[PDB]
Amino acid sequence: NFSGNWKIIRSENFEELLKVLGVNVMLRKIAVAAASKPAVEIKQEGDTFYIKTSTTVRTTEINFKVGEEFEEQTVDGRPCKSLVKWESENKMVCEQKLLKGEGPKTSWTRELTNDGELILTMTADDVVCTRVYVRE
Ligand code: NA
């Protein structure tokens, strides 16, 4: 069960993720700072999820069911069509395809550990960012 309100405890390689997607330095710096203490709300009902991630300047709300395509944005803010699957019991993986144009291959994963941590990974081609959260 991923449901709850989550707070960040670790972040690794976020600014570089943005950098390889081409994000300019002014915007990268604003984004990393804005996301340093995010609010993440998840409501899980079986395979149905609601995930709201808020930084100081942005809020994103996704609604999806595992196995059903949905629209979101890439981490750099480009609209995409996404599809989540269960890789294993505690771990979901998301493939993203841009709605318009082409770009680096992006994806994300979310997994719950036995100690109750939520691990988010985000990838752009060969660059990986890892963020870890715990429940409030
Ligand atoms: Na790369």
State the DSSP string of 62-105. EEEETTS-EEEE-TTS-EEEEEEEEEETTEEEEEEEESSS--S-
Elucidation technique: X-ray
d(CA 67, CA 102): 23
| Resolution value, angstrom units | 1.4
Report d(CA 106, CA 125) in Å as an integer: 6
Residue 121, strand partner residues? 109, 130
Q: Ligand 1: distance of its center to the CA of 122 in Å?
A: 13
| Residue list, annotated binding site | 131-133
Q: Which of 135, 130, 133 is nearest to 14 (CA)?
A: 130
- Token pair, residue 11, equals 């972040």
13 CA from centroid of ligand 1 (Å): 12
**Distance in Å, CA 71 to ligand 1 centroid:** 24
Strand ranges inside 29-69, DSSP E: 39-45, 48-54, 59-65
Domains of the chain: 1-136 (2.40.128.20)
Q: How many of the other CB atoms lie within 10 Å of CB of 24?
A: 10
| Cα-to-centroid distance, 125 and ligand 1 (Å) | 6
List Cβ<8 Å contacts ≥24 apart for 33-39: 34/58, 35/11, 36/8, 36/11, 37/7, 37/8, 38/7, 38/8, 39/5, 39/7
